[PDB]
Design a protein around this nucleic acid. Structure first.
Lengths: 109, 75, 95, 83, 97, 83, 97, 95, 109
DNA sequence: GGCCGCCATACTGGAGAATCCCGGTGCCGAGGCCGCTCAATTGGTCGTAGACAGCTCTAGCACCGCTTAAACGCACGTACGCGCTGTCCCCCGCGTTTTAACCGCCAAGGGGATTACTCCCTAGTCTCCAGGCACGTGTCAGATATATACATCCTGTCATGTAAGTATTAAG
DNA sequence: CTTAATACTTACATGACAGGATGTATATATCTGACACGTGCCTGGAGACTAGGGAGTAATCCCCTTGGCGGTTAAAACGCGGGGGACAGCGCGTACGTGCGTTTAAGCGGTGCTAGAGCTGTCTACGACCAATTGAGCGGCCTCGGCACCGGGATTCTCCAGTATGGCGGCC
């Protein structure tokens, strides 16, 4: 007489796997127990951040008239947001390129 | 139009005659005090301040070319 | 066949279609996003472990995770992530 | 069998192009050997950690995920080869 | 007379190009030879995945991006535009190594 | 009770004393207020972290252990305070 | 005449003395008032362990010591003895602030 | 009525009196010792945890700590560190 | 009834507490199971490191004609060792001061 | 000295090419479809973790009172940053030549990984004893104070390298 | 006689050498409190045994890395030139560096408060463990059109040649 087993991501109405995140925290050895709202809240934060960065990636790709995300778009999206730049200052992107960044003394008169 | 800047520069250097000579800084600020342009004509002053050292009416004290000090000739 | 190697492809794919139904994504960008989600996951996990250490807590709860967010994540995106995380844990609390 | 000079295989025009990506327009003659030296020392700082991982893994084949760990240890967190 | 660009014009065009570009600037196989060379200087006859070699390549290229950006900032602060190894040493010291 | 202009409480000669400890020979007049702003931003970050520690602990008094944790999470680890 | 040292003599004497010294260089009471002031801007009526205030004092002092030696490295790299705000801005931005 | 607070006092005292029988101790220098012991212990323990994760080993043995010493401790000291560690595990297995 | 016990520090013949380091490893959330040689290995490493730095501090104290260590001696000992500086580049020391260091242009003549 | 002409350099319009912008075209990652599996789940359950409550007691907070340390401010003074050319210097631009990198194509096996096996190895726990911290104290090393000695740095002083007028005398 | 060239005496700065004086280091008396040493205890470390699991070890295979072969031209590399850079020289307006008295508020010594920091009993919320079950997500495949690669015209870059203006140069 077992009821229908739904998913905690759908119970939060979210897309990241709450079960996988709670599993990885239980086996990642960061605490003995994990609070009930902790993986849901963590997954919500991660999904919200992923949502902004994917929106920025799609906007940058559309601005670059391309319909598929390339790592160039990801670097241009991350480095042009100040708070994400402070998040990912020391983070290396594979094949992302660099910002177009020239100093004013480097440009001619 | 007016007179050429050679007369202006000679007046600028003859205004003071310090024992240690007028810098290019002090003389261009002196010419700006007169009202003569020193910003776009700095190439003209640039060539002039070696043309006069070469021509011998003025001698260069401690600097080289147009740098440093300048003083009047002996006679 | 081989053993299944779990990754974050399909969830990133769904969130991308939520924010952009029209566009595609490359597998290299997919791996970069997997590195992003794993990196921030481990950062927040280590920070919450440190807070559980400092508070001598056997359990990391959503208070600990919120504390680790507001420590790590800068400013207005952090307070937003608080807002959607709070809304999410409320509507998950109401099943 | 042995190799003795492949640091010069990282060619001067490659360094020129990198500084073009790095935004440097004029690159002194003394720059190239300085870059070779610093890339040299940094690459032992990387590969020492990476190999130490590898015989800690009891392996003989070097994996990229070892490079990822060695870089994130040195604050050089890599996106694009995890997992 | 052939049309010839002023000094830096091709250099700044290369700057715009390679900042636009995303590809690697190092040849993969001599770099692989150097990696194997320094590897056998620590432990003889290691085997290397090619992806590890390109990962080392792109990590080194990212480091070079960072250290010439810091070096260019120093040289501008050093009232220069030709960078010098003294700038690189200064940036290396400021970064804490 | 309200405190208004205590950024000037860190005096200019105190900044000169620190620059002597930093080995600075000549200190411009613009150095002091810029220094005040820089330390303001730095200690604002530190106190943000350490207070966040304090209300996460459901405490009201700022303790030195929280100061140590906040400093070391910015890579500025301090010894001698129960860490 | 009354005796008077040249500019730099007392400066270098203070430099060697404060490099020799280990005490705090900040008036403690206005520093405590300032940290209470800044922390009041976040949450009200906040209280401080006094030892935590002195800990913030030497942490601030040594952080500025590191910033100032980096600043002096930039200034001597800019061939100067008089430090100016672009030195500190360069140090912050290269260090990552 | 008070509660015990643990520190690394007597051990560093024993070690100092072994290397310098006539040298005294200031208390805040001892605080720097306790904080240094805690700092380096946490660094090496976190590195051992990470290596245990990366080799998928749920048990951290002396090999993990040896790897951590080879990583964090630079060179000459690390070589000496391996020397007392090998001699210590040998004499511990012999005892 | 029972064998008379020696500490495992005494079994190693090392002064650092093997039991205390072992329990701080097991309760520090690094692994649920810990190999036996790990805490004795780490404790030997720590005791050797403190032995070296205490030796350096003692010699520095004898240089300054002071019988007792001071954190000025600790600052002089850490900052004048290259590998210890590599260990503690980012570590702040209370009441330590800095190295006596004057740049060459700062000196007269 | 005035007056008048001549060229250097800043403006100012013209031409060739590197790359962007438009098509065009085949193709191979993208993503969609399909089989698989393991992984999330769900509920009992069972032990347990932290919020709560109450207290308590102590160290920061507030208030106060001398007391000069230090900030402050003013003021002389020397040195500092750097602006601009000058002058040596040097590294990119261009172009060509060589050579091995790249491609792409093929052989072969090393160990990465996977499964199996059996063996170490260590956390836990009741209990037992033993050391290290809590706490108190007590006593000489260094802080502090007082009288000397060098440092040292500015100040005071003298010899020396260097620039210049006309006597004098020799030649027109 | 007139005139002119030089050398010698006369004028200017510069660096070389001695000395004090006060700040900083050097030698001697005090005291104190904090290093340091001695004591209660109870928490902490652990011996024995066990449960049970991770993990070392064999093997094999296969595929993914290593080894080799032919052809291109991408890349390296070498060198001439040219125009930019780097950095010193020197001066100058300045800009703190530093001497010094005041003020005052930090510093130092003294008093009362309670906020709250933290110890202790409760217990009720909490969240992991386990048998089973599934369904969504992952291994594999397979098409296709957005993109990879290719080709032609503009834009734009960008240098390069032809003009006012202004400084530079000459005569009567």
């Amino acid at each position: 007489a077992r009821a229908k087993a739904k998913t905690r991501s759908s119970r939060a109405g979210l897309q990241f796997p709450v079960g996988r995140v709670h599993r990885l925290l239980r086996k990642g050895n960061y605490s003995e127990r994990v609070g009930a709202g902790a993986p849901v809240y963590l997954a919500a934060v991660l999904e919200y951040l992923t949502a902004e960065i994917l929106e920025l990636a799609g906007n940058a790709a559309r601005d670059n008239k391309k319909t598929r995300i390339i790592p160039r778009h990801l670097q241009l999206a991350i480095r042009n947001d100040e708070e994400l730049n402070k998040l990912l200052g020391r983070v290396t992107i594979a094949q992302g390129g660099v910002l177009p960044n020239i100093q004013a003394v480097l440009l001619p008169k | 139009s007016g007179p050429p800047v050679s007369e202006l520069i000679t007046k600028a250097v003859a205004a003071s005659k310090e024992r240690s000579g007028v810098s290019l800084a002090a003389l261009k600020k002196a010419l700006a005090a007169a009202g003569y342009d020193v910003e776009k004509n700095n190439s003209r002053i640039k060539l002039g301040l070696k043309s006069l050292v070469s021509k011998g009416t003025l001698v260069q004290t401690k600097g080289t070319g147009a740098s440093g000090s300048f003083k009047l000739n002996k006679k | 066949k081989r053993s299944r190697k779990e990754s974050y492809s399909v969830y990133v794919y769904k969130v991308l279609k939520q924010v952009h139904p029209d566009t595609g994504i490359s597998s290299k960008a997919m791996g970069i996003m997997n590195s992003f989600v794993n990196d921030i996951f481990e950062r927040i996990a280590g920070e919450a472990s440190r807070l559980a250490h400092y508070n001598k807590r056997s359990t990391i709860t959503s208070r600990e995770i919120q504390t680790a967010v507001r420590l790590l994540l800068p400013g207005e995106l952090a307070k937003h992530a608080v807002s959607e995380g709070t809304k999410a844990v409320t509507k998950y609390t109401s099943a | 069998k042995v190799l003795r000079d492949n640091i010069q295989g990282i060619t001067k025009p490659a360094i020129r192009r990198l500084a073009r990506r790095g935004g440097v327009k004029r690159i002194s003659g003394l720059i190239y050997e300085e870059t070779r030296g610093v890339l040299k020392v940094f690459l032992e700082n990387v590969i020492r950690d990476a190999v130490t991982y590898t015989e800690h893994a009891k392996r003989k084949t070097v994996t990229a995920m070892d490079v990822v760990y060695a870089l994130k240890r040195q604050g050089r967190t890599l996106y694009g080869f995890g997992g | 007379k052939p049309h010839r660009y002023r000094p830096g014009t091709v250099a700044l065009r290369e700057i715009r190009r390679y900042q636009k570009s995303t590809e690697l600037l190092i040849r993969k196989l001599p770099f692989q030879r150097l990696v194997r060379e320094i590897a056998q200087d620590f432990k003889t006859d290691l085997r290397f995945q090619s992806s590890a070699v390109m990962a080392l390549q792109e990590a080194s290229e990212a480091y070079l991006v960072g250290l010439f950006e810091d070096t260019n900032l120093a040289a501008i602060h050093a009232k220069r535009v030709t960078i010098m190894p003294k700038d690189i040493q200064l940036a290396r010291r400021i970064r804490g190594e």
